[PDB]
């Protein structure tokens, strides 16, 4: 099932020698094992513009770092990791 619990970014963003980007996220809540409610949005933080490469990101445990490869659009991108307002949100500008 999808997850209710808390998250956090364990490492800095590494953009590939081609285009893609990786995001390592953590599980600080209750519901392990579960699905990661990860997504990407617009400059408005409303319009869902982007590409999710990782097929159904898994949250096996609490001490779990989910490897997530993705392809945002050109310019500003606001990646949403958990569920709600206390959920992760982070800016990334594609040069």
């Amino acid at each position, epitope marked *: 099932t999808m997850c209710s619990g*808390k998250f956090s*970014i*364990d*490492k800095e963003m590494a953009e590939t020698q081609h285009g893609t980007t990786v995001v390592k996220v953590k599980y600080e809540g209750a519901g392990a094992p579960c699905k990661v409610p990860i997504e990407i949005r617009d400059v408005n933080k409303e319009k869902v513009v982007g590409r999710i490469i990782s097929s159904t990101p898994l949250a096996e*445990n609490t001490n779990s770092v989910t490897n997530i490869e993705l392809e945002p659009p050109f310019g500003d991108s606001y990646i949403v990791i958990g569920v709600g307002n206390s959920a992760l949100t*982070l800016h990334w500008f594609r040069k």
Partner: single-chain antibody, 227 residues
Framework: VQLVQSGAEVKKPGASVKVSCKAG???????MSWVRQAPEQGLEWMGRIDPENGDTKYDPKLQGRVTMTADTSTNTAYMELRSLRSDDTAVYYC?????????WGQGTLVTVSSSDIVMTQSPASLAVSLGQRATISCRASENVDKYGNSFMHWYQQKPGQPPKLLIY???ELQWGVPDRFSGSGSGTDFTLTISSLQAEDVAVYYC?????????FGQGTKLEIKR
């Protein structure tokens, strides 16, 4: 999970020490740090390792004397401090995390016997009455911003005990931490609040930046009950 460090060691000036840290998870996708604390002194970040590529970043003050290694096969992180001077007498902790350290080892005492961003915590000490609103400040010499986020964290430390993360990402409250602890601020000015002061809440509080290296800690604020 949790971190297990090697035992206490006595060393002679000029000597070298290597401390281990075994994690009950795969250290590959995390940042492993070493943090030091001289007796009756604040927390000092020593450096960090990315165990996937072996990248090391050290505090300029320890640069040249420290080597940090990490074996993903064993999930052990190592910290070699060479040319041990008398001032290197401290409790050494390994930790895991970028947005605050939610995992800490238990500590390892090392006994030695025969520009750059500034973190200002205010006050150095305060006393409030039980059930009364206590606030602590943390101004940073430069914007601790990364990805449109404030990389300002808050810790709590009771004597002889390892630190505990309370607030990460300037506002975010760590699991198992009471709701009276509020976190706020943006840019360079930040605040830690405590709604109703409980007797457990008597500890030293630290703020920490982690947007870019060094992930400097503040000097600490010793919170007490009004006598």
């Amino acid at each position: 999970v949790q971190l297990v460090q090697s035992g206490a060691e006595v060393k002679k000036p000029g000597a070298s020490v290597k401390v281990s840290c075994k994690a009950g998870f795969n250290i590959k996708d995390v940042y492993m740090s070493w943090v030091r604390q001289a007796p009756e002194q604040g927390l000092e970040w020593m450096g960090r390792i990315d165990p996937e590529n072996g990248d090391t970043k050290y505090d300029p003050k320890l640069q040249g004397r420290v080597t940090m290694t990490a074996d993903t096969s064993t999930n052990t992180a190592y910290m070699e401090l060479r040319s041990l001077r008398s001032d290197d007498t401290a409790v050494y902790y390994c930790a895991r995390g970028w947005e605050g350290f939610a995992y800490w080892g238990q500590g390892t005492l090392v006994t030695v016997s025969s520009s750059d961003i500034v973190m200002t915590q205010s006050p150095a000490s305060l006393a409030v009455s039980l059930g009364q609103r206590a606030t602590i400040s943390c101004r940073a010499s430069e914007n601790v911003d990364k990805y449109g986020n404030s990389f300002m964290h808050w810790y709590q430390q009771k004597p002889g005990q390892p630190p505990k993360l309370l607030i990460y990402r300037a506002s975010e409250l760590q699991w198992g931490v009471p709701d009276r602890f509020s976190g706020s601020g943006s840019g360079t000015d930040f605040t830690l609040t405590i709604s109703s002061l409980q007797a457990e809440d008597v500890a030293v509080y630290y703020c920490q930046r982690s947007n870019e290296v060094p992930w400097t800690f503040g000097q600490g604020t010793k919170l007490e009950i009004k006598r």
